[PDB]
């Protein structure tokens, strides 16, 4: 006796799970990009398959079709704004040739690692998870943030997050107290 | 149940048909609860109903809900899953709130019990009062130490214990005897339906309590 709220599954377990080629391919993916488990790869593959289905359906349509023009321009603009497609690759033949590594590169973990100040993808993962990242001026702690192209230059430490000053954290206070009450006198 | 002793505790777990097992909510499960649960499980499990007390000592609702969930799931591990247990709030007037006591009374006034294997062949008996029957001159003359004639009262459960004298008897925590005599006294706390049946044979307003073991 109310309106149902919509929900969907974001991943899909493969029918052929433990074949060796996809197994060590996704092992390489989860190792180079520092992924926690295989649901990240399945989720990115689900998004890529949805984009591929949309691009195929649009490419079967005739040229200068207003439906094809509108949805193709919207999809290409969205993927350019995300940061997947290059600025000189705005064609449907090029979005049919995309890969999951483009989407895995764009996430916040790599995009804070690639800009420095993290020195490894797992230190970046821990830094994000421990409530440190400031995108723009808003604190982000989600490692799959998928940083926008226009927002790539605003990533820095928080006004909180003691690596950006403002009253160092708890174990530093513990160490200062121990050095004051025991080593101090 | 005498809490400290394990002996009468084991006898209680052997005898009882409904067991109200109570756990301190703020403290948690204790060793006596686990021991009684294992004794009851091994000797033939009766109907176990959990109740948790001392829940007004919690100062936050989050800790109270989490501890209730943890106790309920531990109880669901020890007893069948989905078993419902009662949460008792306070002792504000020497007794629990009326709603929880009402639900306790309502649940055990509609429940039915299971035929255990051990109870349906061996007759057993719960003793309600105790009296020693020896002549005081026999006490005085031969040194107060000769073993006595003792008559004890109670209720029979399980199996008819035959009306021939001399049938062998085991008393838990005492030993093994042979009963000298038996008889059936009239029931001192009859059900009301028994009273309309009796009045119908010829055609108890306040004495719903029969506690000869304690004082009035």
């Amino acid at each position: 006796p109310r309106a149902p709220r919509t929900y969907s599954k974001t991943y899909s377990t493969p029918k052929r799970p433990y074949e060796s080629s996809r197994l060590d391919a996704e092992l390489k993916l989860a190792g180079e990009f520092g992924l926690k488990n295989k649901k990240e790869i399945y989720r990115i593959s689900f998004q890529l398959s949805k984009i591929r289905r949309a691009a195929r359906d649009l490419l079967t349509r005739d040229e200068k079709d207003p439906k094809r023009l509108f949805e193709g321009n919207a999809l290409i603009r969205r993927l350019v704004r995300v940061g997947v497609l290059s600025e000189d690759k705005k064609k449907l033949d090029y979005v049919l040739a995309l890969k999951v590594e483009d989407f895995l590169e764009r996430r916040l973990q790599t995009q804070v690692y690639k800009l420095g100040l993290a020195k490894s993808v797992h230190h970046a993962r821990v830094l994000i998870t421990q409530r440190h990242i400031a995108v723009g001026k808003q604190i982000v702690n989600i490692p799959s943030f998928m940083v926008r192209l226009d927002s790539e230059k605003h990533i820095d430490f928080a006004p909180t997050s003691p690596f950006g000053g403002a009253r160092p954290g708890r174990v530093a206070r513990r160490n200062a107290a121990r050095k004051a009450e025991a080593s101090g006198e | 149940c005498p809490a400290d002793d394990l002996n009468a505790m084991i006898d209680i777990a052997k005898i009882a048909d409904l067991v109200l097992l109570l756990i301190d909510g703020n403290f948690g499960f204790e060793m006596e609860t686990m021991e009684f649960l294992n004794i009851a499980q091994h000797h033939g499990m009766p109907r176990v109903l959990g109740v948790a007390t001392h829940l007004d000592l919690f100062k936050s609702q989050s800790t109270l809900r989490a501890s209730k969930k943890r106790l309920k799931h531990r109880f669901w591990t020890e007893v069948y899953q989905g078993a419902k247990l009662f949460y008792l709030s306070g002792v504000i007037n020497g007794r629990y709130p009326d709603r929880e006591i009402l639900n306790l009374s309502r649940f055990i006034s509609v429940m039915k019990f299971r035929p255990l294997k051990w109870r349906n062949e061996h007759p057993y008996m719960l003793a309600d009062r105790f009296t020693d029957l020896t002549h005081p001159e026999l006490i005085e003359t031969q040194g107060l130490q000769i073993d006595r004639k003792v008559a004890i009262y109670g209720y029979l459960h399980g199996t008819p214990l035959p009306s021939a004298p001399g049938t062998r008897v085991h008393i838990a925590g005492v030993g093994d005897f042979s009963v000298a005599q038996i008889e059936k006294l009239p029931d001192p706390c009859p059900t009301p339906f028994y009273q309309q049946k009796l009045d119908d044979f010829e055609r108890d307003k306040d004495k719903l309590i029969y506690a000869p073991m304690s004082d009035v």
């Binding site: 400031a134 808003q138 604190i139 928080a158 006004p159 909180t160 | -």
Partner: protein
């Protein structure tokens, strides 16, 4: 707790209930939160408001802290601030006292007990008194 910045956006003047409606957002970079009575006092000194005619009621602190956005409104001539406000918000501001009733079960049971008599019931009271007394 260095300073707090109080910004009132989307201000719409509502002469229908004789008030002004706005979305407040506060920059509180250090302390903890908005302190809604203190925020009400400063919002009262903002316009010219006579504090009891000011109502701020919706609030949510942005993730990461520092920024809190809520909806509030300011009346004028506090008489219709008492007329047009809901009772619970009047009690929340100290402008009204919380009335004490029974719970809904007790009220409904009293209604069902009073449903079973016809008239004032003094006749039935005297009848049952003379019947059970003698």
């Amino acid at each position: 707790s260095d300073a707090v910045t109080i910004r009132t956006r989307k201000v719409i003047s509502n002469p229908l209930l004789a008030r002004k409606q706005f979305v407040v957002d506060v920059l509180h970079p250090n302390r903890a939160n908005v302190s809604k009575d203190e925020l009400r006092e400063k919002l009262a000194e903002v316009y010219k408001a006579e504090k009891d005619a000011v109502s701020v009621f919706g609030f949510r602190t942005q993730f990461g802290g520092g920024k809190s956005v809520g909806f509030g409104l300011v009346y004028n001539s506090v008489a219709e601030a008492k007329k047009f406000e809901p009772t619970y918000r009047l009690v929340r501001y100290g402008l009204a006292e919380k009335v004490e009733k029974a719970s809904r079960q007790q009220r409904k049971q009293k209604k069902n007990r009073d449903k079973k008599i016809f008239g004032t019931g003094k006749r039935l009271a005297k009848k049952v008194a003379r019947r059970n007394a003698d």
